[PDB]
Amino acid sequence: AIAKMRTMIEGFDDISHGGLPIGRSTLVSGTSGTGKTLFSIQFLYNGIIEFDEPGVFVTFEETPQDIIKNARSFGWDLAKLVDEGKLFILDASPFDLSALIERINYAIQKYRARRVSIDPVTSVFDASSVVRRELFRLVARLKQIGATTVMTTERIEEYGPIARYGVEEFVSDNVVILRNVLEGERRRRTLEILKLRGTSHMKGEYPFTITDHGINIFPL
Amino acid sequence: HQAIAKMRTMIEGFDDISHGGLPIGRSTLVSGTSGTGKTLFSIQFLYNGIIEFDEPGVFVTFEETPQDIIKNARSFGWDLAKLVDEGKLFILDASPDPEGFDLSALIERINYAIQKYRARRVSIDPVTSVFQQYASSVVRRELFRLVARLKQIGATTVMTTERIEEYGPIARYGVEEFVSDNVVILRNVLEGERRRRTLEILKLRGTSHMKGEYPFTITDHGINIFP
Amino acid sequence: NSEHQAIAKMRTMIEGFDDISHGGLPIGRSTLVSGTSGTGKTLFSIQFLYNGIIEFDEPGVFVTFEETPQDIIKNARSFGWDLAKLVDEGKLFILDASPDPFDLSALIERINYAIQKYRARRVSIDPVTSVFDASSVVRRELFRLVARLKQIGATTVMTTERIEEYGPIARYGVEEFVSDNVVILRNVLEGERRRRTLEILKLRGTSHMKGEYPFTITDHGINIFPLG
Amino acid sequence: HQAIAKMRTMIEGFDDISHGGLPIGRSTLVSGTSGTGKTLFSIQFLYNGIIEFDEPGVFVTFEETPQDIIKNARSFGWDLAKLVDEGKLFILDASPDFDLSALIERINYAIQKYRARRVSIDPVTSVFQQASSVVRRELFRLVARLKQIGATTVMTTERIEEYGPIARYGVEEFVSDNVVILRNVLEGERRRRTLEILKLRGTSHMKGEYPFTITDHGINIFPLG
Amino acid sequence: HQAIAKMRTMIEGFDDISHGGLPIGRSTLVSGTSGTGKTLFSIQFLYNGIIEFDEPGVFVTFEETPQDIIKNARSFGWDLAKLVDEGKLFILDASPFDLSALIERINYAIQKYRARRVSIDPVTSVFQASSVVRRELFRLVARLKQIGATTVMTTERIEEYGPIARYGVEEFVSDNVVILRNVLEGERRRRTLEILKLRGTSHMKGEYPFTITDHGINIFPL
Amino acid sequence: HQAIAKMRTMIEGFDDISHGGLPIGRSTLVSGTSGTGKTLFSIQFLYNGIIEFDEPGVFVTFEETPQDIIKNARSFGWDLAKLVDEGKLFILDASPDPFDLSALIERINYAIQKYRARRVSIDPVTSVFQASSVVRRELFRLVARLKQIGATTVMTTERIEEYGPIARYGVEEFVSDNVVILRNVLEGERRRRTLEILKLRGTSHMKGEYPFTITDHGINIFPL
Ligand SMILES: Nc1ncnc2c1ncn2[C@@H]1O[C@H](COP(=O)(O)OP(=O)(O)OP(O)(O)=S)[C@@H](O)[C@H]1O
Ligand SMILES: Nc1ncnc2c1ncn2[C@@H]1O[C@H](COP(=O)(O)OP(=O)(O)OP(O)(O)=S)[C@@H](O)[C@H]1O
Ligand SMILES: Nc1ncnc2c1ncn2[C@@H]1O[C@H](COP(=O)(O)OP(=O)(O)OP(O)(O)=S)[C@@H](O)[C@H]1O
Ligand SMILES: Nc1ncnc2c1ncn2[C@@H]1O[C@H](COP(=O)(O)OP(=O)(O)OP(O)(O)=S)[C@@H](O)[C@H]1O
Ligand SMILES: Nc1ncnc2c1ncn2[C@@H]1O[C@H](COP(=O)(O)OP(=O)(O)OP(O)(O)=S)[C@@H](O)[C@H]1O
Ligand SMILES: Nc1ncnc2c1ncn2[C@@H]1O[C@H](COP(=O)(O)OP(=O)(O)OP(O)(O)=S)[C@@H](O)[C@H]1O
Ligand SMILES: [Cl-]
Ligand SMILES: [Cl-]
Ligand SMILES: [Cl-]
Ligand SMILES: [Cl-]
Ligand SMILES: [Cl-]
Ligand SMILES: [Cl-]
Ligand SMILES: [Mg+2]
Ligand SMILES: [Mg+2]
Ligand SMILES: [Mg+2]
Ligand SMILES: [Mg+2]
Ligand SMILES: [Mg+2]
Ligand SMILES: [Mg+2]
Predict the structure, then answer these.
(1) What are the pocket residues of ligand 4 if the criterion is a CB atom closer than 6 Å to any ligand atom?
(2) Can you name the residues that pair with C31 across neighbouring β-strands?
(3) Which of A100, A190, C136, E53 places its Cα 20 to 30 Å from the Cα of D195?
C-alpha cells in the first residue's frame, strides 16, 4: 500500500489509518488559535525524538525565538534540537517563491530532513489561478525532493471555505481541518481528516484538547 | 439519428441511477468539493471500460502525476501500471511545470491518443485547469469549445470540476452546468459530526435518469452506490 | 380559454399549462421561462413549437444560442418527436445562433427574415441570456428584442437561466420586469429528493393560477398537474 | 395651520389603512417585485380620481407603451381610451425607442394642459437605472418639483426580494414622503399578496401587512380587527 | 469634578431608560430604517427643551424643507412656526459638500439664538470612503462639543438587525448611540428604541417598545 | 515545564479566565462592537497596575481626547488626572486635529522610557490603518516593536458583528499573540455582555464566553 509516517500525535495516527503518507503534502487549516502551529511543531518534534527524523520548520510571521519560547510550555526544548542539528527553523519573514523553495531544499539537504512544516503557507500569498499555480509548484517540488510536509493555512469561519483562497484544498494530497466551534457559549475543538489521496481514513470530526502535552485527540 | 444511447460504467448502482450509463459520444461533468471521489469516479470509468468491455481509455491529468494516479489506485486493487504497460490505458500528462492556455493543442493531443490507443472512453481531471486562467462569460465559452470538439472526435468523456459548497452552485463559475450536456454532483455532507457521501445525476440532456441524491461509500473496490 | 379576460391567448397544448395560464400564452407577446440547469426550459420551448405545428399547422422558429440544431433534433427524439421531418417540410426552422467551436441588430434581422420566410406564428429563443454587461444595458436590449417581436406579431417563449430555486428570477434582476409574462421552472431538492414545479408568476392583463404546480418530464414531454 | 389632508383613492380597503387616502400634494412610493400590482395601483388611483371626483390624471410610462397600458386596463373593466378621448386622462409616453429636468417640464405642461390633480409615474426606477448618491439627488428633485406643482403622485419602483430592501438603490424610501410596499409572498407553494403602508410623513396609518387580491375590479384589500 | 450630567428630553419613557436624559454637551446618534421616528425624536428633543425649560433649539435639515417639518409637526399639535417666530427655534435649511461652512452656520445659529439644543437630521446627508466619513463626523462632533451644544444626530440604516448606520463607522466616533427599530414579524410591525451605548455613564439595556401617537413618542418599560 | 509569565489585570474574574492575567511582554488584542467596554478594559488594565502594583502606564488615544477619557473614567470613581499629575499615568494624545507609524512608535517608546511604564494601552489600534495585507504587515510591525521594548500591551479593535470576523480586516487576530473578544449579544430584545479569551499563544486559558457587567466599579466578569 501507501507508506505512512507516524505523527505520534495522540489519536491522529488512528484517524489517518497509520499516519501521513510519506513524500506528500498535508494541508492543516483552521481559524485563529485552533492549534495549527502546535500540530506542525509536534509533527517535527515527535519525528526527531522518537524516530531521529530531522525536521525543517518554515515560519513566515512568528519569530524562531517565540516558536521556541511557546513550545517550552509543552516541555519541549527546541533550542536543544536546533543546537544538535536535528531541527532547523527557517525564518521567512521579510513574494519570491523560487527563492523560498531553494532555501527549503537547501535546509532539507543540509539537515537531512524527512519532515517539513510550513506555517502558514497562506503567507506566501492575489488571483486564485496564480495562488493555485504557485501552491502547486511548491507541493510538486517538495514531492520531488521527497519531503513529507505539513502546510498550515488560515480560514475565517468554522464551516465555510477550507482555506483563504478556495483552491488550496484541491492542490494538496491530504487535508486536515482544525475547528474551534462555539456552541452555546462553549468552545469545542475538533479535528477532521477531510481527504487523504490514495488511502483510507476515519471520517468526520473528532474532539481534541490542547494540554501541557500538546494535542490530544479522541477518535472514540 | 436515434434517441441517445448509453455506455455502461459498471460502477455499481450508477448504471441504475443513469438508466443505462453515460450518454455515448458526449461529456459528463462531475462536480464536487475536495475529496468527494471525482478522480476515483473518472478512473473507475476507464478501468471498468478496459476490464469489462476491452474498451481502451485515455486519462488526461492536469495536476496529479501519472505515477501518483497509478499509486493512488492501488488502494482499490487496480493495477493501472499493468494497464498502461499493456497499451489499454493511456495516461496523458497535461500537468504543468514544476521547474519552469492552448486548447486546440490539448484536443490535438487527446485526439491522437484516442486514435493511437483506439480508445472509447476519456477522462479529464480536473477540467477546471483548462479555464483556470480567467470572468464567468469566458469560462463558459471555453468549456463550450472543449465539449464541442470532444463531441466531434466521438469520445465519451467524464470531466471533473470543483465546487466549494455542498448545497450551492454546481461548479465554480455558475456556468459549467448550463454548457454541459450531462451533470453529476458528488457531495460529502456533515450529519452531526459524521460525513455522508451522495451522488446525484442532476441532468442528462435527451434522456432519462433517477432523481435526487443516492448515498455511496468509497471502499477497497472503489465507489459503491445504493439506489 | 375563459371568455371574460382582456388578452387573447394561444394554446401550448402542453398538458396542464393552458389550465394554469387560463387559456395559454398571450398572443403577440413574449413569455419569459426561467429555471436552473436541467429544469425543462428547452423542452418547454420545443414543445411549444411542436404542438403549434402538429395541432394547428402554425409554423415555428427556434432560435438556439448554444445547443446545435443536430443535438436539439437528437434530444427531441427522447419524446418521439421527429423535428428533422418538420424542418424538411418547412414547418419548423431552427435558427443556429450557437458559437463557432454580440450583434443584436443582425440577430433580430435574421429572426425577422426567418419568421417572414416560414410564416411562423410561434418563436422560441433559447436562452435569451446568451444575448448578453450592465443590468441597464441588458434591460434595454431585452426591451428592444421584446418590442421588435411584438411589432412582428410573433408569440414568443424566451428562456433564461437562474442559479437558485428560490432567489433571483433570472440572471440580471431586470428580465422579469421587462417581460409581459414570467414562468418559473423549479427543480427543488429537499430531503435528498427532487420535485419539479412550474409557476406562472405574472401575466400582464389577465388572471392565471398562482403559486407552484407539480410537473414531470417523461417520454411524452412535460406533464403539468393543476390542483385546486 | 392644519395637519396634512388626504385624497381618497377609493381603492377598496386602502383609504381605511391610510386613514383617509394619500397625503395631498405629495408623492407616494409604491414598491414591489415583478407582477405585484404596481401598475394596477397607479392606474386605479388615476381612474378612480376621474370617475369618482372628476379629477384629471396624468400617467407617465417609462417602459410599457400607452397602447399596452390601455389594453391591459380592460382586464379591470376600465376604458382608458375613452378617458383619453375626453381629455380626462393623459398618458405621457416616456418609454424608450435621460434628461430629468426636461422630462419634468414635459410632465408639468401635461398637468397644466389637462388640469390634473393626480399623477402616476411608472416606474420611476427606470429613470435611474443608468451611483445611489445620484439616484437620491435626482429623485429628490423630481419629488420637490411635483410638490411645487401641487400634484398628488404615485411613483412606482421595483425591488427584487419580498423582505429585503424597499427599492433598488437603498435610498428611494428615504427621500419619499410616503412608502407603500406590495408583496407577493411564496410560502408552501402558494402565493399571498399583501400591501403595507410603511410610512406617511406627518400623519397616521395602519401598520404591517394586509392581504389583498387582484380581481376583475382591480385591487381589493382586506383589513381585519 | 464629576461623572457626566444629563439633560432631560421629557420624551415619555426615555429619561427613565437613559437614567436622566442625554449626556450634556455631547452628540447622540439616533439611527433607524425608513419612517422609524428619527425626525420626530429630534424634533421632540428641541420642542420639549423650549416648552419645558425655555432652552432654544436649532434644527438642521438636509432634505425636508422647513415648511414640511412645520407642516408634519402639526400632526402632533405642535406649532413650530410660532416657536420660530418667537426666536426660540431655528430651522436651518441645509437643503438641495462643504462641512466647514455648514459647521460655521450651525455655530452662528447657536450664538444668535442662544441655543442649548441642536438636532441634525440626517447627518448621513453630509457624506453622500468610510475613512473620510469617519474623519468628517469626528470633526463635526468635536466642534459641537467645543461649542457646548447637546446634539441629536440622526442616521439612516437599511436593516433592523444589521449595521448601526450606513458606513459602519458612525457608531464608533459617536459618544452616544440610540437605535430605533421597526421590526416586521408575522405581518405586524413593532417599534422599539434601544440605547446601545452612552460613554462614561449608565443606561438601561436592550429594546423597549414604543408607539408614535398624536402627542409624539411614548416609550414603555418592558 | 516552562510557563509563559503573566501580569495580573486585577479586573474581577479576568485573571481567573486567563489563568494569571495577560502574558508579560506581549500585546493582547481586545476586539468588540460599539460600546462593548473596550476602552474601559484598556483603562482598568492601566489603572489597576498603578494602584495595585505601582506599575506606571501609558494610554495611547486615537480619537477620544484625554479630557473625555478622564471625564468618562469618573463614572467609575477613578481620578485619572491625579494619576497623570503624580506622573504614574501618561495619556498619549494621537487623536485627530482639524499616518506615520514610526513616529508614533518612537513617541510611545519615549513615553515608556520617560514614565518607566510597564503597561501600555492603545485604543483603538484600528485607527492606525484606516488592503487587508498591508494592514497585516503594519500591525505585525507594531506588535514586534512593542515586544522589543518589553511593554505588556492592550490593543483595542473594532468589529461590526457579534459572531463574525474577530476584527475589521480579517487579519488582526492572526497577527496577535493573544486575542480577547468582548461581545454584546442582542437576543429576544435583551443584551448580554460576554468576554472570551479566544487565544493566548504559549499558555493556557479558560475557553468560551463568560458573562460580565459594567457597573460603577468597572468590568465584573462571572466565571461562575
Ligand atoms: N500549555 C498549554 N496548555 C494548554 N493550552 C495551551 C498551552 N499552550 C498553548 N495552549 C493553547 O494553544 C493555543 C495556541 O495554539 P497554536 O498552535 O499556536 O494556534 P494557531 O492555530 O497556530 O494560531 P495562530 O497562528 O496564532 S492564528 C492557545 O491559544 C491555547 O489555547
Ligand atoms: N481504499 C480506500 N478505502 C476507502 N476510502 C478510500 C480508499 N482509497 C481512497 N479513499 C478515499 O478516497 C478519497 C480520494 O478520492 P479522490 O477521487 O482522489 O477525490 P477527489 O474528489 O478527486 O479529490 P481532489 O482531486 O484531491 S479535490 C480519499 O480522501 C479517501 O477518503
Ligand atoms: N425521455 C425522458 N424521460 C424522462 N425525463 C427525460 C427524458 N428526456 C429528457 N428528460 C429530462 O429532461 C431534462 C432535460 O431538460 P431540458 O429541457 O434540456 O432542460 P434545460 O432547462 O433546457 O437545461 P439546460 O439547457 O441543459 S441548462 C433531462 O435532464 C432529463 O431529466
Ligand atoms: N382580471 C384579473 N383578475 C385577477 N388578476 C389579474 C387580472 N388582471 C391582471 N391580474 C394580475 O395582475 C398582474 C399584473 O399586475 P401589474 O399591475 O401589471 O403588476 P406590475 O407590478 O406593474 O408588474 P410589472 O410592471 O410587469 S414588474 C398579473 O400578473 C395578474 O396576476
Ligand atoms: N399623528 C400621528 N399618529 C400616529 N403616528 C403618526 C402620526 N404622525 C406621524 N406618525 C408616524 O410617524 C412616522 C413618521 O416619522 P418620522 O419621524 O418622520 O420618521 P423618519 O425616521 O424621520 O422617516 P424618514 O425621514 O422619512 S426616513 C409616520 O410614518 C407615521 O407612521
Ligand atoms: N457607571 C456606569 N454604570 C454602568 N454602566 C456604565 C457606567 N459607565 C459606563 N458604563 C457603560 O460602559 C459603556 C462604555 O464602555 P466603553 O469602554 O467606553 O466602550 P467602547 O467599547 O470603548 O465603546 P466605543 O469606543 O464608543 S465603540 C457605556 O455604553 C455604558 O453602557
Ligand atoms: Cl483545549
Ligand atoms: Cl466512504
Ligand atoms: Cl420528472
Ligand atoms: Cl390575487
Ligand atoms: Cl406606532
Ligand atoms: Cl452591563
Ligand atoms: Mg500559529
Ligand atoms: Mg482528484
Ligand atoms: Mg436547454
Ligand atoms: Mg408594471
Ligand atoms: Mg425624517
Ligand atoms: Mg472606546
Answers:
(1) C 177, 202-208; D 32, 34-40, 75, 214-216
(2) C157, C181
(3) C136
Identify residue A3 by its one-letter amino acid code.
A
Of A17, A58, A68, A47, nearest to A115 by C-alpha is: A47
Residues contacting B181, CB < 8 A, separation 6+: B23, B26, B27, B28, B147, B204, B205, B206, C71
A48-86 burial, b at 16+ Cβ within 10 Å, e below that, comes to beeeebbbbbbbbbbebebbbbbbbbbebebbebbeeeb
Distance CA E144, CA E148 (A): 6
**What are the residues facing B186 on neighbouring strands?**
B32, B199
Distance, CA of B145 to CA of C68 (rounded, Å): 12
How was this entry determined? X-ray
**Could you tell which of D40, D120, D160, D168 is best to mutate to test the pocket of ligand 4, judged by most ligand atoms within 8 Å of the CB?**
D40
Domain count for chain B: 1
Packed helices C69-76 and C41-56: angle between N→C axes, nearest 10 degrees: 70
Identify all chain E residues contacting F124, using CB atoms and an 8 Å cutoff. 172
- Select from F31, F71, F74, F75 the residue to mutate for testing ligand 6; criterion: most ligand atoms less than 8 Å from CB: F75
**Going edge to edge, which strands form the sheet with C92-96?**
C92-96, C60-64, C122-126, C155-161, C30-35, C181-190, C193-203, C212-218, C221-224
Q: Is A129 in the pocket of ligand 1 (CB under 6 A)?
A: no
Q: How far is F191 from chain A (nearest CA, A)?
A: 15
Nearest to E182 by CA among E192, E171, E172: E192
**Ligand 6 atom with the shortest distance to the CA of E205:** 31
What is d(CA C143, CA C132) in angstroms, rounded to the nearest whole number?
Answer: 13
Kindly identify the ligand whose nearest atom is closest to the C-alpha of F199: 1
Find out whether C71 and B205 touch, Cβ atoms under 8 Å: yes
In this structure, the dihedral spanned by the alpha carbons of residues B62, B63, B65 and B68, taken in order and rounded to 10 degrees, is -130
Quick one: which of D40, D50, D45 has its CA closest to D11? D45
Chain centre distance of CA E59: 9
Minimal Cα distance from A163: which residue of B? B164
- DSSP result, chain B: --SPPEE----TTHHHHTTSSEETTSEEEEEESTTSSHHHHHHHHHHHHHHHH---EEEEESSS-HHHHHHHHGGGT--HHHHHHTTSEEEEE----S----HHHHHHHHHHHHHHTT-SEEEEETGGGTT----HHHHHHHHHHHHHHHHHHT-EEEEEEE-S-TTS-SSSSS-HHHH-SEEEEEEEEEETTEEEEEEEEEEETTS----SEEEEEEETTEEEE--
The residue segments making up the domain with residue B79 are 1-227
> Distance between CA atoms of E191 and E34, rounded to whole angstroms?
12
Rg (CA), chain B: 16
Length of chain C: 228
Q: If you count them, how many residues does chain D have?
A: 225
Q: What gap in Å lies between CA E64 and CA D175, rounded to an integer?
A: 8
After which residues does a break in chain B occur, C–N more than 2.5 Å?
A: 100, 134
Start-to-end CA span in chain F (Å): 29
Q: What CATH number is associated with residue F35?
A: 3.40.50.300
User: What amino acid occupies position B67?
Assistant: Q
- Residue D115 assigned ligand-binding role: no
Is F in contact with B (3 or more beta carbon pairs below 8 Å)?
no
Of E160, E150, E196, residue with least CA distance to E176 = E196
Q: Count the neighbouring beta carbons within 10 Å of the beta carbon of residue B108.
A: 12
**H or E element at residue C20:** helix C17-20
